[PDB]
Design a protein around this ligand. Structure first.
Ligand SMILES: [Ca+2]
Ligand SMILES: [Ca+2]
Ligand SMILES: [Ca+2]
Ligand SMILES: [Ca+2]
Ligand SMILES: [Ca+2]
Ligand SMILES: [Ca+2]
Ligand SMILES: [Ca+2]
Lengths: 358, 5, 358
C-alpha cells in the first residue's frame, strides 16, 4: 500500500474519522484510485473517501488514529505526505520529517452488520443543523430510560422532526424537506447525534439519509456516517405540548434571559427554583435560597390574560432562551400546575415545553 | 419538579 | 453604608479582589472612596473606587461570587445602588433588586502588621516580562515547599526572577535603573499568579515593598500583599552550565514544530528525544516502547564539534513556547551536560534543561 497526498486533502478526513486496541486505529485502504479512511467504536462508523491523483499502490492496514492525525496536523501548510506500508510498520514521510507507526492487520478491523435501507431522503445541510441544534440540549444525560439519552428523528408527511426530552423538559423541531415521506421514527444515540452534527461543515453539499430497521446512514460530500439506532418507546411530544395554552406572553428574548440569569444567582443551588408572577403587561421574577437571600426582576411584557403565578427550574428556562436565537419569545401558559410552552414569537418551527415546579 | 410524561 | 456606582467601575476591582468570611469581600465607604478587599489569609487584594455620587460611610462583607455575578449580570453601564439594611445588603439597579447575606466587617481578617525594608519602582511591563518568562517552571505542590513559588532577587540595578521544579529552571533578569541592596525572597505561586493578574498592561508604575516575611505591590488603585515562603531557594548560578562553547541557532517556530512532531512518538512518561548536531544541521529522533520512531532533520546554524544529546521534549517545548521569538540559541557542551536555551537576540532570559541518556 502506497500513496502520496497533499496535507490539505488528508486533514479534514482524518479529523472526521478520528472523532480493544484496534478501535483506536483507523483502517486505511487504497483501492481503485481512492484512499478510504474508516474509524469505528462498534456502535457507529465514519468513512471518508479521498481521490488519489498521484501514483499509488493498493492495499490496506490500520494505524493509531490520534498519532496519525497529530503527525499530519503537525506538518507545515502545503506539505505533501507520502505513506507506505513496510513490513509491519507504516512509514510516513514529508519533507525531511519521517515517522514509523505501528499497525494492526486490516483483516482484524471490525465491520458493522450488513443491513438494508428502508427509508431514504435528501435535505440541506442547514436543515439538519437547524433540527439538531434546536433540540440537542434537551436530551437526557445518563437516564436509566436509555432511549431518552438519544434523539428521536421522525418523518411525517413531508417533514423531518427531531424530539429530545429528559422527562422534565422537551424540545421539538419540524422542518419541511419537500419529499413525500413515510410515517416513521427512529432514535439516534447521543454520540451519533454529536457525529451527525460534526459532519456538516456548513458548505452547500446536500445530506442523503438512509434509515434501516436498526441503522441510520448519512452521506455528505465524500463522507459516510453510519450509526446503530436505539430500541425503546420514545414519548409522544403531542401529549407533552399543552392542549390549550391560551394565556400568551410576549417578551424580548435577551431581556427575558438576562433577567432570569440574574434571578438565578439567588436560587437554590440544587433545585434552582424561581417564581413567575404574570399580570397585565408585566412579569415579575423572584428567587430565594436557604440563606434567605432574594432576587426580584420586573420586566414589561405583552400580556392581556388572567393573572397567575408559576414556579420553574430556572436552568431549564435559560436553556430554552439560549437555544432561541431570536428577538422575541412567546410563552404560552395554562395554569400554575401545568407545563409552559415557549417558542420564537416569529416562528412555529420549534417548540419547547418546561414542566412547572410545585 | 413535575414530570412531562 | 451607602453608595451608587457605575457597573464598569466595579467590575475590574471585583475581578481583582476575587471559613465562609474568606468567600466574602470587605466593602468600606470612607472619605469619598469605596474600598474592596479579598483575602485567603495568605495574601490580600485591596481595590479603591472613587465615589462621585452621594455616599454614606460604613463597612460590611458580602459573598464575593454572588455580588460579582449580580454586577456583571446587570446591563452595560447600569447604575448600581447599594445600601445596608439590617443583616442584609441591598443591591438595586433599574427594576432589578437583590438582598444579600452579610458578615460583620469586624470579623474580616487582617494580615499581620509589618515593616517595608526594600523598595523600588518599575514599569508594569518589566514585572510582567520577568514573571511570564519564568512562571511555567515553578513547582506545583512539591514536598520541597520552597519550590512552589518564584525567587525575586535584587542585585546592583537589576531585578531577577528564578523558578525551578527541581528538574528544569528558568531565570530572567532586567535592569530597573535604581541601586538596590542585594536581597532575595520567595513569593508563593498563588501570589505570583495574583500579582501577574493585577498588571493591566498600562502606564501606572508598579511600586514594590519587601519586608522580612511579606511583599506588597502597589499599582494605581490596587494594593496586593502576600506572605513570603519562609525557606531557602536553590542557587541558579550552580545550575547554569559552566562554559557552553557549542551554539546552535535556529528559527524558534521551525525548531518548535520539529520537536512537537517528534514528541508524538516519544515515551509518554519520560518524553526523551535525541539530538544529533553536525555542521549547520540538526537531527531529532524519538522512539517509544511500541518501537514507533520519529525523525526530523532541519537546517540550523552550527559550526561546533559533532555531538549527541537527549532531553525531555516537554521541557524543551515549554521553553520554546515561553520564548515567543524569531530565533533561539541552544547552548551546548556535551552529551552528559545540561543545555542552556535563550532568545538568540537576548541574554535576559535563560532556561536550563538536564541531559537524558537514552
Ligand atoms: Ca496490504
Ligand atoms: Ca413543530
Ligand atoms: Ca425561588
Ligand atoms: Ca485575595
Ligand atoms: Ca453604556
Ligand atoms: Ca542578590
Ligand atoms: Ca498615559
Amino acid at each position: 500500500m502506497k500513496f502520496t497526498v497533499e496535507r490539505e486533502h488528508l486533514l479534514k478526513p482524518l479529523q472526521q474519522v478520528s472523532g480493544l486496541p484496534i478501535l483506536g486505529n483507523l483502517l486505511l485502504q487504497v483501492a481503485d484510485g481512492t484512499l478510504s479512511l474508516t474509524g469505528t467504536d462498534l456502535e457507529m462508523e465514519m468513512v471518508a473517501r479521498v481521490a488519489l491523483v498521484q501514483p499509488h499502490e493498493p492495499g490496506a492496514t490500520t494505524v493509531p488514529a490520534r498519532k496519525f492525525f497529530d503527525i499530519c496536523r503537525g506538518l507545515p501548510e502545503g506539505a505533501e505526505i507520502a505513506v507506505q506500508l513496510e513490513g509491519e510498520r507504516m512509514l510516513v514521510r514529508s519533507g525531511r520529517s519521517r515517522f514509523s507507526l505501528s499497525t494492526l492487520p486490516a483483516a482484524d478491523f471490525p465491520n458493522l452488520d450488513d443491513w438494508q435501507s428502508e427509508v431514504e431522503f435528501t435535505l440541506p445541510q442547514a436543515t439538519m443543523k437547524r433540527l439538531i441544534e434546536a433540540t440537542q440540549f434537551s436530551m437526557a444525560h445518563q437516564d436509566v430510560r436509555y432511549y431518552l439519552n438519544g434523539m428521536l428523528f421522525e418523518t411525517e408527511g413531508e417533514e423531518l422532526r427531531t424530539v429530545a426530552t429528559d422527562g422534565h423538559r422537551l424540545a421539538v423541531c419540524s422542518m419541511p424537506i419537500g419529499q413525500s415521506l413515510p410515517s416513521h421514527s427512529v432514535i439516534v444515540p447521543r454520540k451519533g447525534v454529536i457525529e451527525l452534527m460534526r459532519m456538516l461543515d456548513g458548505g452547500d453539499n446536500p445530506l442523503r439519509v438512509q434509515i434501516g430497521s436498526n441503522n441510520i446512514r448519512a452521506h455528505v460530500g465524500d463522507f459516510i456516517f453510519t450509526s446503530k439506532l436505539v430500541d425503546g418507546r420514545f414519548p409522544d411530544y403531542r401529549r407533552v405540548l399543552p392542549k390549550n395554552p391560551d394565556k400568551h406572553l410576549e417578551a424580548g428574548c435577551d431581556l427575558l434571559k438576562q433577567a432570569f440569569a440574574r434571578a438565578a444567582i439567588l436560587s437554590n443551588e440544587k433545585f434552582r427554583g424561581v417564581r413567575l408572577y404574570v399580570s397585565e403587561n408585566q412579569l415579575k421574577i423572584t428567587a430565594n435560597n436557604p440563606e434567605q437571600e432574594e432576587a426580584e426582576e420586573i420586566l414589561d411584557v405583552t400580556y392581556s390574560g388572567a393573572e397567575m403565578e408559576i414556579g420553574f427550574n430556572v436552568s431549564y428556562v435559560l436553556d430554552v432562551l439560549n437555544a432561541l436565537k431570536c428577538e422575541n419569545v412567546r410563552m404560552m401558559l395554562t395554569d400554575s400546575v401545568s407545563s409552559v410552552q415557549i417558542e420564537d414569537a416569529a416562528s412555529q418551527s420549534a417548540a419547547y415545553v418546561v414542566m412547572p415546579m410545585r | 419538579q413535575l414530570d412531562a410524561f
